[PDB]
Amino acid sequence: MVLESTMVCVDNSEYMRNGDFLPTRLQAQQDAVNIVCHSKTRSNPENNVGLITLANDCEVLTTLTPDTGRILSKLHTVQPKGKITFCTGIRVAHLALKHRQGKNHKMRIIAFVGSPVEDNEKDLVKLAKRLKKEKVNVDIINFGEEEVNTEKLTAFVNTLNGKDGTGSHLVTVPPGPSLADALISSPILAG
Amino acid sequence: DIPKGYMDLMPFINKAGCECLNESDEHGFDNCLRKDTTFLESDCDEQLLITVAFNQPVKLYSMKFQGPDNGQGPKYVKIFINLPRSMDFEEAERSEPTQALELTEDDIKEDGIVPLRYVKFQNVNSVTIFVQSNQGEEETTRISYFTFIGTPVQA
Amino acid sequence: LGLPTEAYISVEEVHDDGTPTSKTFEHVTSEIGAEEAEEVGVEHLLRDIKDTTVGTLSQRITNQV
Amino acid sequence: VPGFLQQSQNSGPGQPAVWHRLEELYTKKLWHQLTLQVLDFVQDPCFAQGDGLIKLYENFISEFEHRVNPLSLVEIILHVVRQMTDPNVALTFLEKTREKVKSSDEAVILCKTAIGALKLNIGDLQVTKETIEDVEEMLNNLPGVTSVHSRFYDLSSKYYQTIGNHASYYKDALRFLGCVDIKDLPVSEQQERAFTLGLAGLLGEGVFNFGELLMHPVLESLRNTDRQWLIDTLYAFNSGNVERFQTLKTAWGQQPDLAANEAQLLRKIQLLCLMEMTFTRPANHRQLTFEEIAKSAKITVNEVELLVMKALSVGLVKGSIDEVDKRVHMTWVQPRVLDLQQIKGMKDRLEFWCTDVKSMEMLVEHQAHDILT
């Protein structure tokens, strides 16, 4: 219904090395990106999807492509053997969106954070201000570690959602039943 | 209006390339595009960045960049052309424009047509306008009507 | 004077025998050379007052300078 | 499984907090934080003699993870093996662990070097050397790990109770000190490491000048307090000065490893003295008479032939000897560290060179201005 290019941000840090979800936290985020990409593509057949990792560097394994299968395959063989670096990841994703094919696509990224973001609140707020400056609908989802929706993420979203901003919904996942329906009830209805 | 031998470039505008940054959701990009009292307003600060692409390459002569009389009309505009990638405000401030423009007050009125350096706009594919400041130095800027006067290169 | 291009290749060594880790691009000798049917294009775009492949004395002294 | 932890929540320093953290981490199925916590736990000041229950616990952790990086697991295994202290069962444990984790990571390398380190104490050669060879031969495309190379240091450096590992040992110990970029080692341990590095450098047959040893922070930073005789020895050696009385002072300063090789040391320093000569005359007078070597190296003029003989043979210098006039022509290719004042002097020499070149380019241009056009 809405033209959009989404840069999903998968996590493969060492803090994804968790069993909070039954098989593996990484596997839970894997089918999370699978279902979210399926929903975005079937919602609008000309939408764009791309893949960004966040472990120790921000690889851009898959860029904006309407195809889903290739991003799904690249999602596998991810090997969560790193440490997250959130700020650089969102920077890379934002400029990747800046390189989007169609300019009518509303900018939006999907970010899967499963580790406590080690940063300073000042850089988070300045980055949120910059992202709001470019009219980008970042979407952040907290996974893994128990400090779910940290004050860092809260400030980041709120500054980015300054007075009903883009809709950077700070959804929370339970440490236990992180089932797909719990991963789609809030976002598909509203990010 | 418009000088003899030219035309309004509205039908040549490709909606797939149009993209405006820092716009309030209530005041859409089409408001400045359309010739109505409806206006485009920036949401974050006075700076704005609007990129318009065309179906076919076109040559520009003059622009009608007009807003309201409350001082929130633009005053300093950097025009870039044929941008291969979306434009960033930091670079747009840093980058040297194809043409810098100090919009005097008379430009903002309804009869305000701003001539452009026709030499540098002979192969325009997409034109990006970086509004750096407004007349009244408000926290936001309004654009009542924006368009382009020129002729197609007849691709 | 002499900088048409510079080639580097990454190597796998920390920094030296007894130093911390790094990446340390290594310089490689670079030349400029053309095959046939490409030398002809270069020659044709050239042929200003330049060239004179036969090295006369004046050009040789210029080369010394 | 949590029942074993609960019934064993005692028997540990500060047991309530740490063991309850273990309980909550296990019951939440948290793994990486649990791995870090158990690593810190086995790294606590204690003996952790509850070896059986901790090996059972890591068995459960390693069986349920099936994804946790083998690095943390194998570090835990190394700590527990150092705790249990018995050779054959430890060997079997390491084989079981390496079979458990067969990822291309530095896990098999870590287990192999642990095996070799434990097998240095018994059967120094017939099992350990080939393990070293295997480790070095398939140690590729992981330079930045900087821990597995530290353990390769452990293997090769602890392999130094031989004759050949006197220059090779020095090289590999230096490779270690480079590999472990941050010091983060106790002052006494670094003191011992610098001591054995100095001993290896002095006794290394293939080590002649080899600066960056004195410039290495690990040595100069913490040898200035005690056993300064070794520092003075290194200064004299890399400075070429024979320094007879002080060099003897250190020769009986540390009777082991120095009395039994003093002659070699003398040989070495004599050769180093020769370097100083070819380094103290900047080609203005490359011809040096045998009297200069005899007086400086405190040797009889009959042995200067043999001294220069050895120096040329080993590849240090590339001169020749005119015995009839008692001189030696010197074109040597052994450089050294350059003593920032010396760097300034060499920069001044380069200034002279560049100003000559510039002046004469100006001359040629002015003269040929007619034909340069």
Curated annotation (Swiss-Prot), chain A:
Coiled coil: none annotated. There is a cross-link at residue 122 (Glycyl lysine isopeptide (Lys-Gly) (interchain with G-Cter in SUMO2)). Residues 5-188 form the VWFA domain. GO terms for biological process: proteasome-mediated ubiquitin-dependent protein catabolic process. It comes from the Eukaryota. GO terms for cellular component: cytosol; nucleoplasm; nucleus; proteasome accessory complex; proteasome complex; proteasome regulatory particle, base subcomplex. The 2 UIM motifs are involved in the binding to a multi-ubiquitin chain in a cooperative way. This is 26S proteasome non-ATPase regulatory subunit 4. It comes from Homo sapiens (Human).
UniProtKB/Swiss-Prot annotation, chain B:
GO terms for molecular function: disulfide oxidoreductase activity; protein-disulfide reductase activity. Active thioredoxin with a redox potential of about -250 mV. Residues 1-155 form the PITH domain. This is Thioredoxin-like protein 1. It is found in: Cytoplasm; Nucleus. It comes from the Eukaryota. GO terms for cellular component: cytoplasm; cytosol; nucleus; proteasome complex. Its main location: cytoplasm. The chain holds residues 118 to 272 of 289 of the full protein.
Curated annotation (Swiss-Prot), chain C:
There is a cross-link at residue 50 (Glycyl lysine isopeptide (Lys-Gly) (interchain with G-Cter in ubiquitin)). It comes from the Eukaryota. Component of the 26S proteasome, a multiprotein complex involved in the ATP-dependent degradation of ubiquitinated proteins. This complex plays a key role in the maintenance of protein homeostasis by removing misfolded or damaged proteins, which could impair cellular functions, and by removing proteins whose functions are no longer required. Therefore, the proteasome participates in numerous cellular processes, including cell cycle progression, apoptosis, or DNA damage repair. Component of the 19S proteasome regulatory particle complex. The 26S proteasome consists of a 20S core particle (CP) and two 19S regulatory subunits (RP). The regulatory particle is made of a lid composed of 9 subunits including PSMD7, a base containing 6 ATPases and few additional components. Within the complex, PSMD7 interacts with subunit PSMD4 through their respective MPN domain. Interacts with TRIM5. Belongs to the peptidase M67A family. Does not bind a metal ion. This is 26S proteasome non-ATPase regulatory subunit 7. The lineage of its organism: Eukaryota, Metazoa, Chordata, Craniata, Vertebrata.
From Swiss-Prot, chain D:
GO terms for molecular function: structural molecule activity. GO terms for cellular component: cytosol; extracellular region; ficolin-1-rich granule lumen; membrane; nucleoplasm; nucleus; proteasome accessory complex; proteasome complex. One of its GO terms (biological process) is ubiquitin-dependent protein catabolic process. The modification N6-acetyllysine is found at residue 295. Residues 168-335 form the PCI domain. Keywords: Acetylation, Proteasome. InterPro entries: PCI_dom, PSD13_N, PSMD13, WH_DNA-bd_sf. The keyword Mitochondrion does not apply. It comes from the Eukaryota. It holds the Pfam family PSD13_N. PROSITE patterns: PCI (PS50250). SUPFAM superfamilies: Winged helix' DNA-binding domain. Component of the 19S proteasome regulatory particle complex. The 26S proteasome consists of a 20S core particle (CP) and two 19S regulatory subunits (RP). The regulatory particle is made of a lid composed of 9 subunits including PSMD13, a base containing 6 ATPases and few additional components. Belongs to the proteasome subunit S11 family. Component of the 26S proteasome, a multiprotein complex involved in the ATP-dependent degradation of ubiquitinated proteins. This complex plays a key role in the maintenance of protein homeostasis by removing misfolded or damaged proteins, which could impair cellular functions, and by removing proteins whose functions are no longer required. Therefore, the proteasome participates in numerous cellular processes, including cell cycle progression, apoptosis, or DNA damage repair. This is 26S proteasome non-ATPase regulatory subunit 13. The gene is PSMD13.
